[PDB]
Amino acid sequence: GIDPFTVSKGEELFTGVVPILVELDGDVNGHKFSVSGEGEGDATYGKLTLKFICTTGKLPVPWPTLVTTLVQCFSRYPDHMKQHDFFKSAMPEGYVQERTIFFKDDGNYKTRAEVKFEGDTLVNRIELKGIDFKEDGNILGHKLEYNYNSHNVYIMADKQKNGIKVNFKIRHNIEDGSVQLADHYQQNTPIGDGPVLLPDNHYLSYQSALSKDPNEKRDHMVLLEFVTAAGIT
């Protein structure tokens, strides 16, 4: 565990506005890229405000496909559900979050991230690997709209990993009015060896809005997001 004294533990670290730093290195069908992100989260309200920049030039996949990859510790857990907040309970030492995201009739992303505090800053460091994509598909062919939908994210305990398993589906809007499904399988494990909250089944409700910074000339994405735990009582 940590130093007992460690001024703040788990939930205590998220009572106020916390700065966020996101770092992603990716490789999709050999198209290599990096993204950095910065902003803050206010878990009391489930609120995230973040700006992401492709630091290597043009992003070789659509921004919306990276949203789920690019800090569920910022979810607003109702008081009556506080005993189910795995994500906060793993802090400050943090957790590893792993996903496989299947893009229907296209390739897959496999992601590994470590989410933890570095001082006052909540850091999400991510490696993304994408294979089996079509060069002319909705992803490498850039055929997705720059927008996002609301979703529910379904959580259950994985007692064998002292962690959780998570799953959900994202539907990205295609420019022709159709829909590109991205099925998400996820697992999270604590980095530290201390006790974590292993939750009953529940879900997080998401709202996400994407926009552009009128003064930003690099390839980028502005994200406003609200996340709320629900499903128990």
Of all helices (H) and strands (E), which one includes residue 220?
A: strand 220-230
| Structural domains in the chain plus CATH codes | 1-233 (2.40.155.10)
**Burial of 229: CB neighbours in 10 Å, binned 0-12, 13-18, 19+:** buried
Following DSSP, what letter does each residue of 82-142 receive, concatenated?
GGG-HHHHTTTT-EEEEEEEEETTS-EEEEEEEEEEETTEEEEEEEEEEES--TTSTTTTT
The dihedral through the CA atoms of 12, 97, 170, 54 has a sign that is positive
Phi, psi of 128, deg, nearest 5: -125, 135
12-43 core/surface letters (b: 16 or more CB in 10 A; e: else): ebbeeebebbbbbebebbebebebebebbbbb
Asked if 183 contacts 210 with a C-beta cutoff of 8 angstroms, the reply is no
End-to-end CA distance of the chain: 32
**Residues recorded for the chain:** 233
Given the DSSP bridges, would you call strands 47-54 and 31-42 parallel, antiparallel or unpaired? antiparallel
